[PDB]
Amino acid sequence: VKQVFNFNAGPSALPKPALERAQKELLNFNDTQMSVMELSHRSQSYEEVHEQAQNLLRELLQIPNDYQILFLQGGASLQFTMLPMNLLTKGTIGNYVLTGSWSEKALKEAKLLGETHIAASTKANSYQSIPDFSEFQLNENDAYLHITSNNTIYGTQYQNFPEINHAPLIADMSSDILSRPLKVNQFGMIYAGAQKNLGPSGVTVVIVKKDLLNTKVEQVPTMLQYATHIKSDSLYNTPPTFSIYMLRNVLDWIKDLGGAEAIAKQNEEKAKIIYDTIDESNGFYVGHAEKGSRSLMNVTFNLRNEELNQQFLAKAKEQGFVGLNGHRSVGGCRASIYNAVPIDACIALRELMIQFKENA
């Protein structure tokens, strides 16, 4: 039919082949005559999927053998409290770098559970940039240092990651995990709801340094201990099997296109199409982020006033664009361009933007 361009911010576009694959075998997976949704997670067919999703991640991000990959329910939001529940012990401090709203939500949960600190923040200037690592206020009794790699709502992104040796570096990478190569051993733990860049909602990927967290924490509910899930290989209770399956399928697609390095090249190219459009618009479009901090995953911008904002967004929606409204907390526009968003969608958006401008 008519064109649809999927710029949704979370859940978001999936690569077609992962969906076509799921559709074809939805009733009969691996010749079992059952859907993968109808299998025991103790079945060999399911365990194969579960293990493959782990191995694809390991290969794709080159995760070291002393790290384990967890598949957990609860979203990134649950990790905001699980992390301090496991590591924020008495006498220690949950140190946070604030670079957007998701960083604030993480901080708030640690505040419920222990001593927190703010290592650096760009909140004063409305989170238009990533602070300089030299500005980081570190504490000897920090339980960890927590960052948000990609600030989904504000459109900013870490270009690189700090070297931290006094405490584990922890990162919420929900909206840019596996959008580029990563040196996993810079971190003690990385977590990501899958629904932004890895597939479906309903599973959260947690890459953890095994020895930081494979030990029982006294007084923590069984389900909320990392140790529980490490020990049981994320099979302590029933996992989200279809979500993990779809994650597998998406990872297979990333591998098929050349991995993290190739997808980074694609992601830089799509982002460039949109930022050049902003930058050649003579101020008709104004990006929120400072140039050195521009996200490759979420492009945030405004028109010169709210009326033009609304007319632009209404025109987009009439032309088949989905998800461009900025997050409710900040308004404006947000083009989410995660791995699976196709480049011709980006070209289409540029065309929209240029004709709207010319005709305004």
Ligand X SMILES: *Cc1c(COP(=O)(O)O)cnc(C)c1O
Tell me which of 95, 103, 150, 241 binds its own copies, using CB under 8 A.
241
Total residues binding its own copies (CB under 8 A): 68
Q: Strand, helix or coil at 207?
A: strand
Which is closer to its own copies, CB of 42 or CB of 283?
A: 42
Cβ count near 34 (within 10 Å): 15
Amino acid letter for position 198: L
Site for its own copies contains 12 (CB under 8 A): yes
CB 344 to Mg ion: min, Å:
4
Contact indicator for 132, 121 with CB cutoff of 8 Å: no
- Note if 176 is an active site residue: no
Which is closer to its own copies, CB of 217 or CB of 347?
A: 217
- Note if 102 is an active site residue: yes
Tell me which of 100, 168, 240, 287 binds its own copies, using CB under 8 A.
240
CA 202 centroid distance within chain: 13
Tell me which of 3, 126, 237, 311 binds ligand X, using CB under 6 A.
237
CA 239 centroid distance within chain: 20
Total residues binding Cl ion (CB under 5 A): 7
Q: Please spell the DSSP secondary structure of 97-145, one letter per residue.
A: EE-SHHHHHHHHHHHTTSEEEEEEE-GGGTS-SPPPGGG----TTEEEE
Site string for Cl ion, 142-171 (x = CB under 5 A): ---------xxxx-----------------
Helix axis angle, 241-256 to 16-24, nearest 10°: 130
Site for its own copies contains 38 (CB under 8 A): yes
Site for ligand X contains 240 (CB under 6 A): no
- Residue ranges in 159-298 assigned as alpha helix (H): 210-213, 226-231, 241-256, 259-279
Site string for its own copies, 114-153 (x = CB under 8 A): ----------------------------------------
DSSP label at 15? Answer: -
Q: Which does 256 bind (CB under 5 to 8 A by kind): Cl ion, Mg ion, its own copies, none?
A: Mg ion
Q: 35: burial class by Cβ within 10 Å (0-12, 13-18, 19+)? A: middle
Tell me which of 103, 129, 149, 195 binds its own copies, using CB under 8 A.
195
* Maximum Cα interatomic distance, the chain, rounded to a whole number of Å: 64
Q: Which residues contact 32 (CB under 8 A, 6 or more apart)?
A: 39, 43, 45
Q: Which two tokens stand for residue 37?
A: 């949704």
- Note if 172 is an active site residue: yes
Which is closer to Mg ion, CB of 17 or CB of 114?
A: 17
**What residues make contact with Mg ion under the rule CB under 5 A?**
252, 256, 344
Site for ligand X, rule CB under 6 A: 10, 75-77, 102, 148, 152, 172, 174-175, 193, 196, 237-238
- Chain residues binding its own copies by CB under 8 A are 1-2, 4, 6, 8-14, 16, 19-20, 22-23, 26-27, 31-35, 37-43, 73-78, 80-81, 85, 108-109, 112-113, 193, 195, 199-203, 219-224, 236-243, 246, 322-323, 328
